[PDB]
């Protein structure tokens, strides 16, 4: 059948390269993050302090 028949057969493998990340924290959607803290906290703190 020739080296053609079994060259259009043999899959192509992908080896990983490193992709170093800064790992900034994940920001969840507001609806979900507002459940964590009490409802009352909104506008209660001086955020400069």
């Amino acid at each position: 059948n020739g080296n053609s028949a079994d060259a259009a057969y043999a899959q192509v493998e992908i080896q990983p390269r490193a992709n170093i990340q800064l790992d900034f924290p994940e920001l969840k959607p507001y609806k979900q993050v507002k459940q964590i803290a009490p409802a009352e906290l909104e506008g209660l703190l001086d955020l400069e302090r």
Partner: protein
């Protein structure tokens, strides 16, 4: 020399409870942009 110390660190997601949805979403956008730029800076600074 009697140097006692304690710090308490609280999870950062307790902060976002204090602000409005509008303000949070603006922050999330701004961080996301800054983070992409920091990754750009870091990898360039590392290899060179």
């Amino acid at each position: 020399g009697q140097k006692g110390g304690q710090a308490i660190v609280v999870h950062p997601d307790y902060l976002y409870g204090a602000i409005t949805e509008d303000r949070y979403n603006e922050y999330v956008a701004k961080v996301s942009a800054r983070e992409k730029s920091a990754y750009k800076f870091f990898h360039n600074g590392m290899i060179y």
